From Swiss-Prot, chain G:
It is found in: Nucleus. Interacts with RNA polymerase II and the DRB sensitivity-inducing factor complex (DSIF complex), which is composed of SUPT5H and SUPT4H1. Interacts with KDM6A. Interacts (via SH2 domain) with SETD1A. Interacts (via SH2 domain) with POLR2A phosphorylated at 'Ser-2'. Interacts with IWS1, AICDA and PAAF1. Interacts with histone H2B and H3. Interacts with WDR43. (Microbial infection) Interacts with human cytomegalovirus/HHV-5 protein UL69. It comes from Homo sapiens (Human). Ubiquitously expressed. It comes from the Eukaryota. Belongs to the SPT6 family. Histone H3-H4 chaperone that plays a key role in the regulation of transcription elongation and mRNA processing. Enhances the transcription elongation by RNA polymerase II (RNAPII) and is also required for the efficient activation of transcriptional elongation by the HIV-1 nuclear transcriptional activator, Tat. Besides chaperoning histones in transcription, acts to transport and splice mRNA by forming a complex with IWS1 and the C-terminal domain (CTD) of the RNAPII subunit RPB1 (POLR2A). Residues 1-74 form the SH2 domain. This is Transcription elongation factor SPT6.
Curated annotation (Swiss-Prot), chain I:
Tumor suppressor probably involved in transcriptional and post-transcriptional control pathways. May be involved in cell cycle progression through the regulation of cyclin D1/PRAD1 expression. Component of the PAF1 complex (PAF1C) which has multiple functions during transcription by RNA polymerase II and is implicated in regulation of development and maintenance of embryonic stem cell pluripotency. It comes from the Eukaryota. Phosphorylated. Dephosphorylated by PTPN11. This is Parafibromin. It is found in: Nucleus. It is linked to Hyperparathyroidism 1: An autosomal dominant disorder characterized by hypercalcemia, elevated parathyroid hormone (PTH) levels, and uniglandular or multiglandular parathyroid hyperplasia, adenomas, and carcinomas. Hyperparathyroidism 2 with jaw tumors: An autosomal dominant neoplasia syndrome characterized by primary hyperparathyroidism, ossifying fibroma of the maxilla and/or mandible, renal tumor, and uterine tumors. It is associated with increased risk of parathyroid cancer. The gene is CDC73. Belongs to the CDC73 family. It comes from Homo sapiens.
Length: 101, 115, 151, 44, 148, 50, 74, 82, 175
């Protein structure tokens, strides 16, 4: 992806409260909006991803994203969605700081 | 060199039982009937007759291996009924139909021969 | 000739352990010949089975739990589809997306992306064949096939 | 949260399952893995 | 009751892209009371349908008027009163997808519910309020009746 | 694209540029690498002893 | 007495005197199951009625494939 | 190579599983005392598999390092996956 | 009262025991009874389970209701109304545990009890499943010995299965 698309898709946005309300439950939304330690953690997450992206650009100087790796993460996420009856159309109770840690 | 004798497909071996009954424990009111030295002839007619019974929920048969001479019939009935009862009643119905068919064929042959 | 060599063969080299090869991280065995041609026909959208035919096929399903599923069509006549029976065959609750060989190239970008006119998109979800015609791409030896995901 | 925790456990389990086993005769395996496709190909 | 949706549809096109299967045809229908859009695969060998036909369509989560739920197993010897008695063509299926026009900030105004009836596919599309009973992975019954 | 020149635009995207490349019949890798206007980073040989 | 194969916490392949010796330091109501001298189809169940008092109950074995095995029905 | 810090994998390898099962089965076949309840079991390999699942095989795996040292692992100290 | 009742096998060899049962069902996580013995927990004759379930309500509103559940290690000491209130019992294998209960067939087969109430069986995946359990009609829950992240799905499965059946059968009781 391009720089703009990369930032759009991968950088957590803790300013837009309407979108946050769409995605997260209310208590998590308040914590994300108010807490500053959490926001710094999310920014560090994105900076780590940006450095990773530069490294990948070096490893695969062509644009070939297809790689051979052990754990099929997308299939595992789909399995988790089915096992736990995840309704995508509702805000979730997963704190974004819990993902980072 | 390894050919089985032809009679092996219809003659019971010493000690072999014609029919064995077991319970199917996955679901209630289900039995497996194993029949030795029979093939699609009996299995198919019995299954079709069982499917005519409104108190039979499942009826099917299979030959596990064409080089062996066994058929398995699986029957499930409603709880107010028994797979043993359904099997017995299916055989009785088939015998009745065959007897009627034999009588009527005799009558038709006689008519055709007279004129 | 000994319990130790028997145990070696049992634990290292039995056919089922060999289903995926490290040469190319994909299955070495797939569905071939009659079974493949027939399963392609079986999973077409307009394959309907009566009560008796269904019971016979279930007779041949070694892992069947003994419950006849609700037919996809209840009236005017109870009819099961090939996809329902095949769903009974699929193990666990695996999830897999594939495309049939005759899948048109522009379908995925038009409307009907998720409701295929030709039934050319294979979707197994929660162990159930929701849509699509099975073929070599879904049951063969290629990486990411249904048999690979089952393994 | 529950699904995420299950996911973390599943990733760890599968990753550990993917690790090479000491005793693996990887030289013979590599020789077979290159020779068999060679039998599949032509001289010209 | 257990009824998720109900309306009267007019068949506006059949197999617009040409016939893909011998015994199944794809109907394109529009409803009038709620302006819903419908795509529906139908076994036309047993239930023939012609252009311009009208039918009453009901999507229900249960066949029992007392609202009781089902195990999802064939129960042919059950004789409780059933909604199916009022209808000609009945299918059993599963919701496999719900799409909408929602944005990152706004709820959806139009929803599309996709259902698979053992591989015969249905897409019901319209205003989100009509489609609020539909949940992915839920089983539904489709009830159809031609009316003259 | 396996021989095209792949760049990263200032917007941050991979872009394939068509450019002229030369294939020879023999090999003198050291001399060809030192020729002016020849790319000394990518110019290569299929002869591994060289 | 004949040795047996029973992976039970309270089973000991000991004679009656040996069981009593170990049972003297145990608590009231404890049980020790040991091979029965009556034969290969019997088991002796020893439990401490009270300090210094012990009751032995003979249990017959029916439906065993080997003498050392435990009877199917006791 | 003090077993204080054993640096080899905490998982039993497939080769270790195969050979442990075989060796224990041969021992059972030669009237070695069994470690689990045999209830209705007679094949030595099946008994050995039961013992392995119960973590009762009385065998120690001695893993040699390339350097020459070794590490001793009780069959019950290793994680059995398959 | 209206709080359902769960019956656990009395033998200590089962993978579920009174203290372990509270933890398993309350927290939906596995803990071998041996670890709890190391912890020196105190076994109680009666135990309580506080499960938080979201309530299906119109309009999408969810209220995290904490319905208590009652666990009895010894089921003999229950009054007939309490016996009626019972809805689930785990079977550890042998049938001698069940003998002494109401609704038991004269032969001794507990199939009548299992038809009336839901019975599960809990054991490790590797262990061969008790043939006596297989003949009866009891659901089976498989727990991995080493992987500890496979317990939340299976215990969710147990709760969901018990619910579905119970709401269908007995609605007066506070499921």
């Amino acid at each position: 992806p391009s720089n703009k698309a990369f930032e759009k898709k991968f950088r957590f946005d803790y300013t837009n409260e309407r979108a946050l309300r769409r995605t997260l439950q209310e208590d998590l939304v308040k914590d994300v909006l108010s807490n500053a330690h959490i926001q710094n953690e999310l920014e560090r997450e994105f900076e780590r991803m940006r450095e990773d992206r530069e490294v990948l650009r070096v490893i695969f100087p062509t644009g070939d994203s297809k790689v051979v790796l052990p754990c099929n993460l997308l299939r595992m996420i789909w399995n988790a969605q089915k096992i736990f009856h995840i309704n995508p159309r509702l805000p979730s109770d997963l704190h974004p700081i819990k993902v980072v840690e | 060199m390894n050919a089985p004798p032809a009679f092996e497909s219809f003659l019971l071996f010493e000690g072999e039982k014609k029919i064995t009954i077991n319970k199917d424990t996955k679901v209630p009111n289900a039995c497996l009937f194993t029949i030795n030295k029979e093939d699609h002839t009996l299995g198919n007619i019995i299954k079709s007759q069982l499917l005519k019974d409104p108190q039979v929920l499942f009826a099917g048969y299979k030959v596990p291996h064409p080089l062996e001479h066994k058929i398995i019939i699986r029957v499930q009935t409603t709880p107010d009924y028994s797979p043993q009862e359904a099997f017995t009643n299916a055989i009785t119905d088939l015998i009745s139909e065959l007897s009627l068919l034999e009588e009527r064929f005799r009558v038709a042959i006689k008519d055709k021969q007279e004129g | 000739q000994s319990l130790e060599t028997r145990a070696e063969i049992q634990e290292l080299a039995m056919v089922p352990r060999m289903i995926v090869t490290p040469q190319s991280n994909r299955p070495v065995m797939g569905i071939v010949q009659d079974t493949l041609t027939a399963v392609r026909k079986f999973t077409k959208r307009d394959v309907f089975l009566e009560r008796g035919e269904v019971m016979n096929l279930l007779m041949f399903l070694s892992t069947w739990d003994g419950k006849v599923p609700q037919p996809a069509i209840l009236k005017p006549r109870p009819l099961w589809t090939g996809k329902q029976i095949f769903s009974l065959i699929i193990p666990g609750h695996i999830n897999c997306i594939r495309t049939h060989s005759t899948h048109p190239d522009d379908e995925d970008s038009g409307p009907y992306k998720h409701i295929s006119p030709g039934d050319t998109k294979v979707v197994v979800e929660n162990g159930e064949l929701i849509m699509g015609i099975l073929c070599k791409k879904s049951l063969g030896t290629s990486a990411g096939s249904l048999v690979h995901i089952s393994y | 949260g529950e699904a995420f925790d299950w996911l973390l456990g599943e990733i760890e389990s599968k990753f550990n399952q993917a690790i090479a086993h000491p005793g693996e005769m990887v030289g013979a395996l590599a020789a077979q893995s290159l020779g068999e496709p060679a039998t599949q190909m032509t001289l010209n | 009751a257990g009824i998720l949706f109900e309306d009267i549809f007019d068949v506006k096109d059949i197999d617009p892209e040409g016939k893909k299967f011998d015994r199944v045809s794809r109907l394109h229908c529009e409803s009038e009371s709620f302006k819903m859009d419908l795509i529906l695969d139908v076994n036309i060998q047993i239930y023939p349908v012609d252009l311009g036909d009208k039918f009453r369509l009901v999507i229900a989560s249960t066949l029992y008027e007392d609202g009781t739920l089902d195990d999802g197993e064939y129960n042919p010897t059950d004789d409780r009163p059933s909604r199916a008695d009022q209808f000609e063509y009945v299918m059993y299926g599963k919701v496999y997808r719900i799409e909408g026009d929602e944005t990152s900030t706004e709820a959806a105004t139009r929803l599309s519910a996709y259902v698979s009836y053992g591989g015969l596919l249905m897409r019901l599309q319209g205003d989100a309020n009509n489609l609020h009973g539909f949940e992915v992975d839920s089983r539904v019954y489709l009830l159809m009746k031609k009316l003259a | 694209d396996n021989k095209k020149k792949i760049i990263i635009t200032e917007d941050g995207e991979f872009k394939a540029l068509q450019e002229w490349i030369l294939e020879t019949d023999g090999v003198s890798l050291m001399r060809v690498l030192s020729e002016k206007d020849v790319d000394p980073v990518r110019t290569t040989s299929n002869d591994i002893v060289e | 007495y004949i040795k047996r194969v029973i992976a039970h916490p309270s089973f000991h392949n000991i004679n009656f005197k040996q069981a009593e010796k170990m049972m003297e330091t145990m608590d009231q109501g404890d049980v020790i199951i040991r091979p029965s001298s009556k034969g290969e189809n019997h088991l002796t169940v020893t439990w401490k009625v009270s300090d210094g008092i012990y009751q032995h109950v003979d249990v017959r074995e029916e439906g065993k494939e080997n003498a050392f095995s435990l009877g199917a029905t006791l | 190579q003090a077993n204080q810090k054993r640096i080899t994998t905490p998982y039993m390898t497939k080769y270790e599983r195969a050979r442990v099962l075989g060796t224990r089965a041969l021992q059972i076949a030669m009237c070695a005392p069994v470690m689990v309840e045999l209830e209705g079991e007679t094949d030595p390999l099946l008994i050995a598999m039961k013992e392995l699942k119960a973590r009762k095989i009385p065998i120690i795996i001695r893993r040699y390092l390339p350097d020459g040292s070794y590490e001793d692992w009780g069959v019950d100290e290793l994680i059995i996956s398959d | 009262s209206r709080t359902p009742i769960i019956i656990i096998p009395a033998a200590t060899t089962s993978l579920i025991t009174m203290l372990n049962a509270k933890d398993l069902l309350q927290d939906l996580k596995f803990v071998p009874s041996d670890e709890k013995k190391k912890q020196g927990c105190q076994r109680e004759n009666e135990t309580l389970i506080q499960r938080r379930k979201d309530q299906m309500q119109p309009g999408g509103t969810a209220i995290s209701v904490t319905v208590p559940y009652r666990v009895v290690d010894q089921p003999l000491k229950l009054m007939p109304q309490d016996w009626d209130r019972v809805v689930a019992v785990f079977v550890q294998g042998p049938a001698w545990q069940f003998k002494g209960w109401p609704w038991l067939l004269p032969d001794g087969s507990p199939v009548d009890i299992f038809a009336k109430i839901k019975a599960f069986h809990l054991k490790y995946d590797e262990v061969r499943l008790d043939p006596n359990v297989q003949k009866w009609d009891v659901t089976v829950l498989e727990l991995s010995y080493h992987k500890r992240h496979l317990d939340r799905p299976v215990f969710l499965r147990f709760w969901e299965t018990l619910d579905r059946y119970m709401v269908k059968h007995k609605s007066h009781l506070r499921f």
